Design a protein around this ligand. Sequence first.
Ligand SMILES: [Mg+2]
Ligand SMILES: [Mg+2]
Ligand SMILES: [Mg+2]
Ligand SMILES: [Mg+2]
Ligand SMILES: [Mg+2]
Ligand SMILES: [Mg+2]
Ligand SMILES: [Mg+2]
Ligand SMILES: [Mg+2]
Ligand SMILES: [Mg+2]
Ligand SMILES: [Mg+2]
Ligand SMILES: [Mg+2]
Ligand SMILES: [Mg+2]
Ligand SMILES: [Mg+2]
Ligand SMILES: [Mg+2]
Ligand SMILES: [Mg+2]
Ligand SMILES: [Mg+2]
Ligand SMILES: [Mg+2]
Ligand SMILES: [Mg+2]
Ligand SMILES: [Mg+2]
Ligand SMILES: [Mg+2]
Ligand SMILES: [Mg+2]
Ligand SMILES: [Mg+2]
Ligand SMILES: [Mg+2]
Ligand SMILES: [Mg+2]
Ligand SMILES: [Mg+2]
Ligand SMILES: [Mg+2]
Ligand SMILES: [Mg+2]
Ligand SMILES: [Mg+2]
Ligand SMILES: [Mg+2]
Ligand SMILES: [Mg+2]
Ligand SMILES: [Mg+2]
Ligand SMILES: [Mg+2]
Ligand SMILES: [Mg+2]
Ligand SMILES: [Mg+2]
Ligand SMILES: [Mg+2]
Ligand SMILES: [Mg+2]
Ligand SMILES: [Mg+2]
Ligand SMILES: [Mg+2]
Ligand SMILES: [Mg+2]
Ligand SMILES: [Mg+2]
Ligand SMILES: [Mg+2]
Ligand SMILES: [Mg+2]
Ligand SMILES: [Mg+2]
Ligand SMILES: [Mg+2]
Ligand SMILES: [Zn+2]
Lengths: 252, 52, 91, 97, 77, 135
Amino acid sequence: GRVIRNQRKGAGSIFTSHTRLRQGAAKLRTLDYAERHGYIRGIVKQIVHDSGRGAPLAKVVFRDPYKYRLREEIFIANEGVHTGQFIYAGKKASLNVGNVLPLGSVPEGTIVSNVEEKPGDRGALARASGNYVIIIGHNPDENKTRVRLPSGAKKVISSDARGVIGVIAGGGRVDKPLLKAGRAFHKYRLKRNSWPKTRGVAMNPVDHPHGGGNHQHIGKASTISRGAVSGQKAGLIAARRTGLLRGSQKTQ
Amino acid sequence: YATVSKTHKTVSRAYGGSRCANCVKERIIRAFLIEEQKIVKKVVKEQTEAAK
Amino acid sequence: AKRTKKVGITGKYGVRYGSSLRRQVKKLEIQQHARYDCSFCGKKTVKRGAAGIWTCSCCKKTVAGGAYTVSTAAAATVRSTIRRLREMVEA
Amino acid sequence: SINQKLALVIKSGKYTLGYKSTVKSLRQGKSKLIIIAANTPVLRKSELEYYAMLSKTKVYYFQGGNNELGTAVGKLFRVGVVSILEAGDSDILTTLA
Amino acid sequence: AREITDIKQFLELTRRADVKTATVKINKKLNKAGKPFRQTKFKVRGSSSLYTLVINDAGKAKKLIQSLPPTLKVNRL
Amino acid sequence: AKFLKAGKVAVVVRGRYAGKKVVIVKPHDEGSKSHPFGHALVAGIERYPLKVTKKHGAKKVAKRTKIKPFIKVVNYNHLLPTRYTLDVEAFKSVVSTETFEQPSQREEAKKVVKKAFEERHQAGKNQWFFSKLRF
RNA sequence: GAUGGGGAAGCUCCGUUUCAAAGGCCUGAUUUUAUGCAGGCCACCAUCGAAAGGGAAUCCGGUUAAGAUUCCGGAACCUGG
RNA sequence: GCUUGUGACGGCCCGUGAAAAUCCACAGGAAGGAAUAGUUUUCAUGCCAGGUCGUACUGAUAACCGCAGCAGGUCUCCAAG
RNA sequence: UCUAAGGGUCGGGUACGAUCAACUUAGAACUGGUACGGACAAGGGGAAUCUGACUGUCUAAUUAAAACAUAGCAUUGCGAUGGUCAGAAAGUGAUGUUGACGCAAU
RNA sequence: UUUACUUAUUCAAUGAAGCGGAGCUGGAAUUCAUUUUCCACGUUCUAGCAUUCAAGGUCCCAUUCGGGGCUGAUCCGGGUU
Ligand SMILES: [Mg+2]
Ligand SMILES: [Mg+2]
Ligand SMILES: [Mg+2]
Ligand SMILES: [Mg+2]
Ligand SMILES: [Mg+2]
Ligand SMILES: [Mg+2]
Ligand SMILES: [Mg+2]
Ligand SMILES: [Mg+2]
Ligand SMILES: [Mg+2]
Ligand SMILES: [Mg+2]
Ligand SMILES: [Mg+2]
Ligand SMILES: [Mg+2]
Ligand SMILES: [Mg+2]
Ligand SMILES: [Mg+2]
Ligand SMILES: [Mg+2]
Ligand SMILES: [Mg+2]
Ligand SMILES: [Mg+2]
Ligand SMILES: [Mg+2]
Ligand SMILES: [Mg+2]
Ligand SMILES: [Mg+2]
Ligand SMILES: [Mg+2]
Ligand SMILES: [Mg+2]
Ligand SMILES: [Mg+2]
Ligand SMILES: [Mg+2]
Ligand SMILES: [Mg+2]
Ligand SMILES: [Mg+2]
Ligand SMILES: [Mg+2]
Ligand SMILES: [Mg+2]
Ligand SMILES: [Mg+2]
Ligand SMILES: [Mg+2]
Ligand SMILES: [Mg+2]
Ligand SMILES: [Mg+2]
Ligand SMILES: [Mg+2]
Ligand SMILES: [Mg+2]
Ligand SMILES: [Mg+2]
Ligand SMILES: [Mg+2]
Ligand SMILES: [Mg+2]
Ligand SMILES: [Mg+2]
Ligand SMILES: [Mg+2]
Ligand SMILES: [Mg+2]
Ligand SMILES: [Mg+2]
Ligand SMILES: [Mg+2]
Ligand SMILES: [Mg+2]
Ligand SMILES: [Mg+2]
Ligand SMILES: [Zn+2]
């Protein structure tokens, strides 16, 4: 029986990211002295489009506290920030859109992007065009701060995790129908070779668990076990319910 | 540009062949003003620190 | 001379895709091609190019915005809150 | 209102509009008061502010954009600064301003 | 590569050390409208370029010719 | 006041001398037969004295503190008027309209102002002015 | 795709600046003499990979059985010293 | 007019359409440098040298691939009335 | 074989004149063995049923289709100490220059 | 079994740059003897400029030109975080 498609992807061949044009990797300034005792000013020098990315990047330059030289970063531009704006990054920094601040130093309800899970991880949560996280409370002893991620999951991280005030630019990108195959084609052209998708049900059995049969059909329950095994896992993996979600969602 | 005399690679004001002149005009005012305001900032909050 | 009764800019697509999809695109297209007021010098000269990048003909300021509109409801109301929350920490 | 005063001036006094020419006026010390629109950049502002102190000239920060300042002075274009040289009947020169 | 007109400057080339050869060319040409006139070009082969000097005037040229360095190596025509 | 009067310090804002500090010595508020614009006659400092330090001994100090002047007919619209101000009297005369026209006269004026400007830099007098404006 | 490394019985596999003590430039100090040391930097980390990508600089006339932007003639231009 | 080069514009994008060598410039001002004579080779002129391998022809209904002088295949530029 | 309309370029005290250069388009006569896009070039049309929406894809060498794909719709997994996938192993790898407006699976 | 430790083991970050402890100074504090303490302890109108062990102060070399110490910049532990 053939190795099925989702196993092929993992060896990375034709499947690696299409990376040539990307601006570089977006990430918060390293968490040095300045940024964790005081604050430090930069200028957003240019907000610029990263290929295969939802949202704009924002080239933002600073001085090097230790050497005479400019050091620049790549920020995912939060909506509203602009060329020439000044950015402040540090514990003791003000609470405006664009600035980056430790989740401790912002009151509940603040709305921040590109927030790191562990302090200094140069930023992990909420980076997609549109997304953000709201702080939903603090526990001063063992400095934690609780947030609600884009998914709706709540999660509770260190007060020193730096976030950046605001939401991520280019929002609403997904309200626009792609309309034709070509746009999806050109979309994926700059991400990775994952389009278009042949249904497992159009293949022969060599090819897929869904393969073959005299009509197209899945033949057995397509909800597959967590403890399935590579070559089995295709369909609705670990699915704990299934069917048209009738009723208002939204976690409590 | 290395087969061609220095005058071809500049104009005569500060930042010759480098910034756009209307852009140096700007540097200058800003330079001047931000520096002047520094004095006010120094001496205004200097006042505070005897009356507070 | 009124040129189309209703498909507007969406005429290029002609008959394909279906009235409803065309209807949706037409909206955000009108949104994204439109020419906006600039916060900074106050001339309506902010046009898009690249999603979320809005930049200004004269005075050359580029603003990061929504993917098809300059400002976004969410981002506005966030701006709004950050005001509110900031002020709580001046007085 | 402040607009109302300004509109009094504009219908009976003497005034110039725009950055280049209110500087002519500041140099001459002809200016009695200069009015500055919100969105006008800080360099421009701080520059006027300086010419302003030097000529010993009070300054009003119109809490409106250049678009409306143009409306204020009753002009179909925009203005980022006004300069009063002669106040008509209006009390802008010697009121709250 | 170089055309010259300072009859002073010229002479200073002809006595310029690196300058072995020279060469005079003569040209029938027409003047303004009708007539012809005898143009003469004075070519000095320097090391890095050939300097040429046109004397449109016949007289001006003949005199200029005896002026040529006795030790120069003129190619006549 | 018409603050471009007889002693005001300004910074050149356009052209070669752009960025350099000056002193108005005589203003021609409105007009010339030539210079159709409001313009000033400034003498100013082109090559500033280089910062001097304890380490600097004897002749280098003398060397470091040389000043190089210049004199300019200049449009008002190219000066940033300053709050500061420097006494002009020793080269009142030497900087005139008649100073310009003929180079020789210009060269002399600069000699004079140079002697003036250098004496003045020693012993504090008018500080700031002898210090470069960085931008 | 070498390298300190890490796997592997092993042929070898992985890593590519990577948990590595990873190197050479400017000239001064020599006037025993040729290069030891006097500064100060730069921490940049191999290498291969395009006869369509990047890229110092040449043209015209003449010429052979068969070569020519390569010869000859003339007239240039670039790079280094 | 045709080919082609180029310009100032304009349309499109959930697509916004390489890298590095290399070259220049500016900010800086270490430092060096004159009247009994100094500084200057980014102005001109002048001197020397420029290695190594490829360079013929075919490129196709006969010089390549299809057992072949095979009606197949096999990337391009110039283009008159 | 005629007719009409559509342009350039110059001087005028602080209404025009003079020439230069163009195939387009409409109108009117005459004329022929009624022929004339004279060769060349160049859509057959209509009314329905079944079926796939469309443009695109494939069985090189018997199947081009109604099959594949697509946009759209819906479901599932996952907050990185992670989901899915690679490897004999590992101080190993793909997604990942990535972060739910995301990646993965139907 | 719970929960605590940090040196094994494990994860990240950085040209292992400012860690932990004490002291200075400000100042809230209310003084129940006098300090028991708690925080602070150089940067936010502006698309400028920020580099040569740093200027200053002070101490030496034996004054020449150069150059060095200390301070500026508080102590103590070498646990990079
Ligand atoms: Mg990759
Ligand atoms: Mg594919
Ligand atoms: Mg689908
Ligand atoms: Mg499919
Ligand atoms: Mg599918
Ligand atoms: Mg099948
Ligand atoms: Mg099977
Ligand atoms: Mg099965
Ligand atoms: Mg089946
Ligand atoms: Mg089915
Ligand atoms: Mg020039
Ligand atoms: Mg200079
Ligand atoms: Mg290897
Ligand atoms: Mg190579
Ligand atoms: Mg090549
Ligand atoms: Mg090439
Ligand atoms: Mg030939
Ligand atoms: Mg031969
Ligand atoms: Mg041949
Ligand atoms: Mg030759
Ligand atoms: Mg030759
Ligand atoms: Mg040379
Ligand atoms: Mg072509
Ligand atoms: Mg573009
Ligand atoms: Mg250049
Ligand atoms: Mg030195
Ligand atoms: Mg030279
Ligand atoms: Mg050949
Ligand atoms: Mg042949
Ligand atoms: Mg053959
Ligand atoms: Mg054949
Ligand atoms: Mg006609
Ligand atoms: Mg005519
Ligand atoms: Mg009729
Ligand atoms: Mg039927
Ligand atoms: Mg079909
Ligand atoms: Mg088509
Ligand atoms: Mg077939
Ligand atoms: Mg078969
Ligand atoms: Mg077909
Ligand atoms: Mg067939
Ligand atoms: Mg449907
Ligand atoms: Mg291991
Ligand atoms: Mg560290
Ligand atoms: Zn604008």
